[PDB]
């Protein structure tokens, strides 16, 4: 089991070595479009790029590049789009991607300002009466409502294709207490938030893939997706023992580089999946225990 392995890695304190082995075996595919000169100002970080084979293409003829990867989990039957925190010049591209991919939810794992630096553009409206128009992609974005909890906020947004006047409801799930290169405060807090996203419909197959991002879109974003996919695999079989976390993470890293950025994020992933297994294997009451322990009030 993952719990035995977990205890076999703590004992020997070999989380650094396990995680480094993940880094050494991880896929290496080209990111030639990302590195084209004309795309320099569409990338937030030099060293975080989408692979060409899995990148999201915008449906525009000018320049279809966005720093975003489709993570398609075949066995689990769930897809995610992982992207960087939009730049001041890519907020129109970001919402264009949400529209064209038919996403219902956006999961944001970072704060706009972290450790005194701007990590992400303010790409959604903070006030109902102050809507946003992205002139380049011809899209309108209105804040419809907000539900502020102690460590996360859920927003209902209305996204409108101004060309066709069609409108969609987008749910924005904003985790505000997860430090960059850090871990959530508890398994319970993380799982309470993940199950909030799940319960919204945003991850369901009748919608486009959920969009998940932090500043770079690999560390916190990878931790979130890895936990969700592992729990889903366990769910399909009701067989916690058939789930190999390291193998799942390596499969995900075929679609975007760098997923999970520290050995303690890897270790936290194990914690989250082990705890979440209690719900999957039949203990429904544990979901209310997470909500209490997370102190969202
Ligand atoms: O470019 V792919 O055939 O790996 O979706
Ligand atoms: O914004 V991250 O360093 O959690 O990919």
From Swiss-Prot:
GO biological process entries: actin cytoskeleton organization; cellular response to angiotensin; cellular response to fibroblast growth factor stimulus; cellular response to hypoxia; cellular response to nerve growth factor stimulus; cellular response to nitric oxide; cellular response to platelet-derived growth factor stimulus; cellular response to unfolded protein
The record's Gene Ontology cellular component field reads: cytoplasm; cytoplasmic side of endoplasmic reticulum membrane; cytosol; early endosome; endoplasmic reticulum; endosome lumen; glutamatergic synapse; mitochondrial crista
Effect caused by changing residue 214 to S: Catalytically inactive mutant; abolishes sulfhydration
- Modified positions (Phosphotyrosine) are 19, 65
How does it get modified post-translation? Answer: Oxidized on Cys-214; the Cys-SOH formed in response to redox signaling reacts with the alpha-amido of the following residue to form a sulfenamide cross-link, triggering a conformational change that inhibits substrate binding and activity. The active site can be restored by reduction.
Q: List every position bearing S-nitrosocysteine.
A: 214
What result follows from mutating residue 49 to A/D? No phosphorylation
Q: What is its EC number?
A: 3.1.3.48
Name the organs or tissues of expression.
Answer: Expressed in keratinocytes (at protein level).
Molecular function per GO: cadherin binding; enzyme binding; ephrin receptor binding; insulin receptor binding; non-membrane spanning protein tyrosine phosphatase activity; protein kinase binding; protein phosphatase 2A binding; protein tyrosine phosphatase activity
User: According to its UniProt record, which reaction does this protein catalyse?
Assistant: O-phospho-L-tyrosyl-[protein] + H2O = L-tyrosyl-[protein] + phosphate
Q: Locate the Cysteine sulfenic acid (-SOH) modifications and list their residues.
A: 214
Family named by the database record: Belongs to the protein-tyrosine phosphatase family. Non-receptor class 1 subfamily.
The record's function comment reads:
Tyrosine-protein phosphatase which acts as a regulator of endoplasmic reticulum unfolded protein response. Mediates dephosphorylation of EIF2AK3/PERK; inactivating the protein kinase activity of EIF2AK3/PERK. May play an important role in CKII- and p60c-src-induced signal transduction cascades. May regulate the EFNA5-EPHA3 signaling pathway which modulates cell reorganization and cell-cell repulsion. May also regulate the hepatocyte growth factor receptor signaling pathway through dephosphorylation of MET.
Q: Spell out the protein name for this chain.
A: Tyrosine-protein phosphatase non-receptor type 1
Name of encoding gene: PTPN1
